[PDB]
Coordinates of C-alpha atoms in Angstrom, one line a residue:
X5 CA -20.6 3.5 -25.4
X6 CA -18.3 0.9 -24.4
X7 CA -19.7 -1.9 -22.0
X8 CA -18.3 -5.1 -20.4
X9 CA -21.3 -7.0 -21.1
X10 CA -21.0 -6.2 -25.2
X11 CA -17.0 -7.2 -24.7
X12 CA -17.5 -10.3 -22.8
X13 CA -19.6 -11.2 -25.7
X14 CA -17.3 -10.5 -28.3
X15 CA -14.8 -12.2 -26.3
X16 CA -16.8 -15.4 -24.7
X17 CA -15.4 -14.2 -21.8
X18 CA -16.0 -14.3 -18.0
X19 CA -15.4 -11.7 -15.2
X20 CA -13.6 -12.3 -12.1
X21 CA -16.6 -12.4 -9.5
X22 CA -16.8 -9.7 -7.1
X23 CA -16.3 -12.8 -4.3
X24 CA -12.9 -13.3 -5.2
X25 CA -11.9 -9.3 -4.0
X26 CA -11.7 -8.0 -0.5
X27 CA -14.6 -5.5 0.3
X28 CA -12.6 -2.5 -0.3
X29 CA -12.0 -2.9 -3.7
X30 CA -15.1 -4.0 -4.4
X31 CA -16.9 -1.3 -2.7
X32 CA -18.5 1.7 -5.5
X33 CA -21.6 2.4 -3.3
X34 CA -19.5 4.9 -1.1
X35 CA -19.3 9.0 -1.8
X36 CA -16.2 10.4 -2.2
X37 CA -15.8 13.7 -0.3
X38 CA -12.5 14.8 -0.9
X39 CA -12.4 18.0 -3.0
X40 CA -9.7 20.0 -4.9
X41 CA -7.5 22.0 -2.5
X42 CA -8.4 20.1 0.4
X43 CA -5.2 19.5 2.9
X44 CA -4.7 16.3 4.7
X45 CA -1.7 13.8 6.6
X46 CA -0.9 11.2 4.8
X47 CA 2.5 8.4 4.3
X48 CA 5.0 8.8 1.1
X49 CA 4.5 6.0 -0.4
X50 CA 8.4 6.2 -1.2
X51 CA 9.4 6.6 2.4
X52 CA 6.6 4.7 3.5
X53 CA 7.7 5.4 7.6
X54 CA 6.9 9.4 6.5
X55 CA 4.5 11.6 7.2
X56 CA 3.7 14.7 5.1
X57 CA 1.3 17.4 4.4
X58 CA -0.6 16.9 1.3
X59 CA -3.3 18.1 -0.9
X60 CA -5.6 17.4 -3.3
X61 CA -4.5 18.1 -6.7
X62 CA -7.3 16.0 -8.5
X63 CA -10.6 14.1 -7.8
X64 CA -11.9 11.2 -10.2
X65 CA -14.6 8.7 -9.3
X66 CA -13.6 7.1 -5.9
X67 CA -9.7 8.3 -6.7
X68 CA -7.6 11.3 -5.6
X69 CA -4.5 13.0 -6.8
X70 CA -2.4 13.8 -3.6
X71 CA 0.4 16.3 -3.8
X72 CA 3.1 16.7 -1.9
X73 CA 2.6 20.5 -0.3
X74 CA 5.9 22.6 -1.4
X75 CA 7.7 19.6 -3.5
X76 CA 7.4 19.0 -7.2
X77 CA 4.5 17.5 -8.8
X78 CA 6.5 14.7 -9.9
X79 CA 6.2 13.4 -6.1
X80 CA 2.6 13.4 -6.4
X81 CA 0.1 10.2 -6.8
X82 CA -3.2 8.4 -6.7
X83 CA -5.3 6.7 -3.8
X84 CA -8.3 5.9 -3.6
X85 CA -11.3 7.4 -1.4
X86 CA -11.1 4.8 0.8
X87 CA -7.2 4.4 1.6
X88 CA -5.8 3.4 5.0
X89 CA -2.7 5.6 4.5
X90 CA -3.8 9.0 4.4
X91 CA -5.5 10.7 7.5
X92 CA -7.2 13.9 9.0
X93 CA -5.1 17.3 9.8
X94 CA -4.2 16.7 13.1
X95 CA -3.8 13.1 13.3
X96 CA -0.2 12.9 14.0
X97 CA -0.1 15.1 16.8
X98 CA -3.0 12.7 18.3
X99 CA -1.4 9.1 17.7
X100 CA 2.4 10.6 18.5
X101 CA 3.6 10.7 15.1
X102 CA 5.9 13.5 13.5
X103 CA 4.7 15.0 10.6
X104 CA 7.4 15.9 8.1
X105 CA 6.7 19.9 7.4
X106 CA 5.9 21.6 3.8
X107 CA 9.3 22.4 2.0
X108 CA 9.9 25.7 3.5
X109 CA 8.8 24.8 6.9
X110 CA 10.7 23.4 10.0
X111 CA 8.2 21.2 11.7
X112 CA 9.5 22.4 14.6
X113 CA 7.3 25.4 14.0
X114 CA 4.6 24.4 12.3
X115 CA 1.0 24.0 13.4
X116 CA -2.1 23.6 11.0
X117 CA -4.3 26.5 12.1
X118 CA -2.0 28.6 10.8
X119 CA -0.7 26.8 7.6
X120 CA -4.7 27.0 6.9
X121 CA -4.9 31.1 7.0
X122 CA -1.6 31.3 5.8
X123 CA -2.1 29.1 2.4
X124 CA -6.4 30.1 2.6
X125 CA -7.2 26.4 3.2
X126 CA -9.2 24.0 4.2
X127 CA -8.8 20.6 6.3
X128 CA -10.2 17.6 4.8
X129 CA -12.9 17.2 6.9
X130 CA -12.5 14.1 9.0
X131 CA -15.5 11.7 8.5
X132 CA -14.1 10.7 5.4
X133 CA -11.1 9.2 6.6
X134 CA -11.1 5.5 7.4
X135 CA -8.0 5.2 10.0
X136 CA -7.5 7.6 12.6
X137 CA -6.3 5.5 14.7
X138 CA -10.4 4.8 16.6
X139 CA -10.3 0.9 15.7
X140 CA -8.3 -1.9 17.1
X141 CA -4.7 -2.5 17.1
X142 CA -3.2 -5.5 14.6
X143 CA -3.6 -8.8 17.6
X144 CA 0.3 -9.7 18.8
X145 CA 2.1 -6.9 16.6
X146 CA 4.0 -4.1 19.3
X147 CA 5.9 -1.3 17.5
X148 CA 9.7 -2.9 18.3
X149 CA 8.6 -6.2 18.1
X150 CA 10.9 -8.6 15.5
X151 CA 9.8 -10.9 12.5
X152 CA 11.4 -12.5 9.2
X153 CA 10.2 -10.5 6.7
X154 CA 10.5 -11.3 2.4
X155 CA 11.7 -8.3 0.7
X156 CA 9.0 -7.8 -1.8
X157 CA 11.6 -6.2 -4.0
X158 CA 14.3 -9.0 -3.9
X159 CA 11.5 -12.4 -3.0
X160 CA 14.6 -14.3 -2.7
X161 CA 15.2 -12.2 0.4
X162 CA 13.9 -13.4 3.6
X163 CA 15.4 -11.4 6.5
X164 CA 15.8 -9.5 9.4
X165 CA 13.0 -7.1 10.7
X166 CA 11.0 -5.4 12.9
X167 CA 7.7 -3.7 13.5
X168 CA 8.5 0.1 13.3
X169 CA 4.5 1.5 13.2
X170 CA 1.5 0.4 14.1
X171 CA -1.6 2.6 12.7
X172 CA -5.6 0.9 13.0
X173 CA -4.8 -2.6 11.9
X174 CA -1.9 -2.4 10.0
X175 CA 1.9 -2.2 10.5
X176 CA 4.8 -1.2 8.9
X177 CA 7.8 -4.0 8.5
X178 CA 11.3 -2.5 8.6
X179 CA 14.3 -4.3 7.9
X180 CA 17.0 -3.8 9.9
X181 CA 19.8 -1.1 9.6
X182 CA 19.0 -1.3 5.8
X183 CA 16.9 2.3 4.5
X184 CA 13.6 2.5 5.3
X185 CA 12.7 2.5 1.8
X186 CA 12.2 -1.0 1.5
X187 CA 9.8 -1.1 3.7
X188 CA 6.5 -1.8 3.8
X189 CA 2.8 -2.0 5.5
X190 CA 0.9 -4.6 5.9
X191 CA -1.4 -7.1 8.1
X192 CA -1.3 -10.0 10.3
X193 CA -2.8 -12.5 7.2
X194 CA 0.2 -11.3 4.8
X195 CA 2.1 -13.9 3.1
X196 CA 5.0 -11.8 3.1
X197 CA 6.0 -12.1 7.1
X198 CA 6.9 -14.9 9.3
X199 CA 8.0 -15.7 12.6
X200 CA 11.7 -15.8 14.1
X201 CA 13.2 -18.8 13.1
X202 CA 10.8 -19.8 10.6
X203 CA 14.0 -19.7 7.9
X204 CA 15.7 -22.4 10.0
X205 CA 13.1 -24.5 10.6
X206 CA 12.6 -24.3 6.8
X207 CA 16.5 -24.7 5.5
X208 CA 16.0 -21.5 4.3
X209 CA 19.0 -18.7 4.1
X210 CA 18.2 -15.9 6.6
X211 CA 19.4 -12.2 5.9
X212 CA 21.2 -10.5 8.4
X213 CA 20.7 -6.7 9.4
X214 CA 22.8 -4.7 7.0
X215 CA 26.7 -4.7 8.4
X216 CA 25.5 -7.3 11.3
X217 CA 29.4 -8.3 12.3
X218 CA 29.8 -11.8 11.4
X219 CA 26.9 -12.0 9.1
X220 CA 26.9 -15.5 8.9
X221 CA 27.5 -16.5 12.4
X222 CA 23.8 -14.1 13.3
X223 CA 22.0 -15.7 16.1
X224 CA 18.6 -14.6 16.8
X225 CA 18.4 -15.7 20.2
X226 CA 21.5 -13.2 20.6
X227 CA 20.3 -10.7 18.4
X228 CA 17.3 -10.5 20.7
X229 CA 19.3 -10.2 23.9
X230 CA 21.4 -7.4 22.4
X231 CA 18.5 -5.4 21.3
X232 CA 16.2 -6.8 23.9
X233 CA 13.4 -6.8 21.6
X234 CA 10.7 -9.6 21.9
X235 CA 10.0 -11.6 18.8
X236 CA 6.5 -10.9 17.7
X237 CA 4.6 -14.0 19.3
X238 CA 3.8 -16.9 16.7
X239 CA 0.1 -17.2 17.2
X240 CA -0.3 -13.9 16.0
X241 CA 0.5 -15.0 12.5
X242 CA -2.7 -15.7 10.3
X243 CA -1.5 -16.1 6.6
X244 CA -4.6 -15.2 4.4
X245 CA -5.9 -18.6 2.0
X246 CA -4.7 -18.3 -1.7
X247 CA -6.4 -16.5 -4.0
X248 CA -9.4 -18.1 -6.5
X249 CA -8.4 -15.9 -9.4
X250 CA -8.3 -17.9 -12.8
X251 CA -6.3 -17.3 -15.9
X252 CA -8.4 -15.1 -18.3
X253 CA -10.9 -13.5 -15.8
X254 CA -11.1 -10.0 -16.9
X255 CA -10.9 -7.3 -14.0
X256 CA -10.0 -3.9 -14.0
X257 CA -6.6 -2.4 -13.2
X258 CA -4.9 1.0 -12.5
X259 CA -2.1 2.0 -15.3
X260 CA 1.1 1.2 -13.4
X261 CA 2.6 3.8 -15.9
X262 CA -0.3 6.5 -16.1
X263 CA -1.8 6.1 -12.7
X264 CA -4.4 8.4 -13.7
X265 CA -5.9 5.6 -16.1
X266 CA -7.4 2.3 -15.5
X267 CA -7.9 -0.4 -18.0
X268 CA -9.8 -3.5 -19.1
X269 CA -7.6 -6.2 -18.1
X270 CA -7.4 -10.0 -18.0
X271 CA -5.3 -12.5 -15.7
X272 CA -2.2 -14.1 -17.5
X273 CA -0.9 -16.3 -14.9
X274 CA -1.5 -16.9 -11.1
X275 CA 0.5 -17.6 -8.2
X276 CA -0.9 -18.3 -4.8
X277 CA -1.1 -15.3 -3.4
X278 CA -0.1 -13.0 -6.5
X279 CA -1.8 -12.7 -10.2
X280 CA -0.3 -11.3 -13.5
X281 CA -2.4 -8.5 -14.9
X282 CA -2.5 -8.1 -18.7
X283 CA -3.9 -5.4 -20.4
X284 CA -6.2 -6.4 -23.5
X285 CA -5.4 -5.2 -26.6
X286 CA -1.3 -4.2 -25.9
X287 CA 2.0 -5.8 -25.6
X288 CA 2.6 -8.6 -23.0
X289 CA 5.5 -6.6 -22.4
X290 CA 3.4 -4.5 -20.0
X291 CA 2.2 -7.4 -18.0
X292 CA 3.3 -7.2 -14.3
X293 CA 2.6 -9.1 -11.0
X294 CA 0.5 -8.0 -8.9
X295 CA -0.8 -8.7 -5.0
X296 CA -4.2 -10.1 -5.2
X297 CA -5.2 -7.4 -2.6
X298 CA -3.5 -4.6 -4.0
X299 CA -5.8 -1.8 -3.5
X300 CA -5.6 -1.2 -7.6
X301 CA -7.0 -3.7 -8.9
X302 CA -10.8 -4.3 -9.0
X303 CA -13.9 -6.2 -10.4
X304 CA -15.7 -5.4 -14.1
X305 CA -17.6 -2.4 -13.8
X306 CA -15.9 -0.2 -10.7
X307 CA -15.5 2.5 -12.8
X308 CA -18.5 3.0 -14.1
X309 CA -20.3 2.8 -10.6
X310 CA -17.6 4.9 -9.4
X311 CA -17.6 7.6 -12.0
X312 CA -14.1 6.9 -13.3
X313 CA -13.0 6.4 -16.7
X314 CA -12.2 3.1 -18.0
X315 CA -9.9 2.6 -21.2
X316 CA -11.1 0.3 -23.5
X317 CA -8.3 -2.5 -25.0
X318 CA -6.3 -0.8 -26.6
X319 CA -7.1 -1.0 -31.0

């Protein structure tokens, strides 16, 4: 009953064109296959370097509920069909990855065939996966190689880091001797990364591994003589071009509180690689920054080609 067109309207309003999002979050054309019960590999997104077993608690639209096999529910969340960071039963063993095993399991003796009969199973069938590690390798970025890296949680943070993972075209950025929940995955054209010595060369402060002795006296010429890591090479840096989002463009957006929902929302204020998501009809208290290719974000009328809900503004 409720339609963009009727609200844009009301509203004299404009969409955010489908041009301005990458092709994965635009794309509602694609089937998703995943059913309920079906087991797959995927990364905890709060120990993003992990590996675990996990199923399909839900399916809606192009989205999946993922639980975390033997943990609480309260571990589980949402991706959708067409995420990089879950993968087939099986792909660990293939790209030499340890899989972490089911509470009540010691990986050390675990092996699917079995967990299949033993829990009456299936395997997420693999054809619906897009990585499993077929296509190309990031260009310049070696598992061990070091960067500068932003810490997304503290943007005032540039420092220390390396690549720890390397998975289709992506990698994971760890920062050094801190925990490896700060890391985070990403691509050659992220805004996020730069070079050794990019900090001096732009007056910038430069973050030391955690405990480094002599924090401020860190040389990375040194550094990378004690460690004998190589620096990941400059040419394989590609930042992506800012974003063409405009303030009030309406989009829809995933509930950052109920994950299970996804509302009409508008553009509050842009940055040039971020934009602020508002959700019509509530509190600007709820509005939050978000990357412009986040993978929860998408154009007016995903849901509906999808088969998802969409919550109206809120009245």
């Amino acid at each position: 009953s409720w339609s963009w067109e009727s609200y844009l309207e009301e509203q004299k309003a404009i969409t955010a064109p489908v041009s301005l999002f990458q092709d994965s979050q635009a794309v509602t054309h694609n089937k998703n296959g995943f059913k309920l019960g079906m087991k797959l590999e995927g990364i905890d997104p709060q120990h993003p370097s992990m590996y675990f077993i996990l199923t399909v608690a839900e399916v809606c639209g192009y989205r999946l509920r993922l639980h975390f096999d033997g943990y609480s529910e309260c571990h589980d969340f949402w991706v959708n069909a067409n995420s990089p960071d879950i993968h087939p039963a099986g792909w660990f063993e293939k790209t030499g990855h340890k899989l972490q095993p089911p509470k009540g399991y010691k990986e050390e003796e675990f092996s699917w065939s079995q967990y299949l009969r033993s829990t009456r199973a299936q395997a997420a069938p693999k054809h619906l996966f897009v990585s499993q590690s077929h296509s190309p390798p990031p260009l310049g970025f070696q598992v061990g190689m070091k960067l500068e890296a932003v810490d997304r949680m503290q943007p005032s943070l540039v420092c220390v880091a390396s690549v720890t993972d390397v998975v289709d075209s992506r990698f994971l950025v760890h920062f050094d001797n801190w925990d490896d929940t700060y890391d985070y995955w990403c691509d050659p054209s992220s805004p996020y990364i730069h070079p050794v010595g990019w900090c001096q060369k732009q007056g910038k402060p430069l973050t030391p591994p955690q405990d480094y002795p002599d924090p401020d006296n860190f040389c990375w010429e040194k550094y990378l003589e004690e460690t004998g890591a190589s620096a990941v090479p400059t040419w394989a840096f590609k930042v992506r071009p800012p974003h063409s989002f405009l303030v009030n463009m309406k989009l829809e957006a995933v509930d950052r509180r109920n994950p299970a929902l996804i509302r009409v929302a508008s553009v509050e204020d842009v940055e040039d690689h971020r934009i602020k998501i508002h959700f019509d009809g509530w509190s600007h208290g709820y509005d939050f920054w978000i990357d412009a290719d986040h993978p929860d974000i998408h154009p007016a009328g995903w849901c509906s080609k999808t088969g998802h809900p969409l919550q109206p503004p809120l009245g």
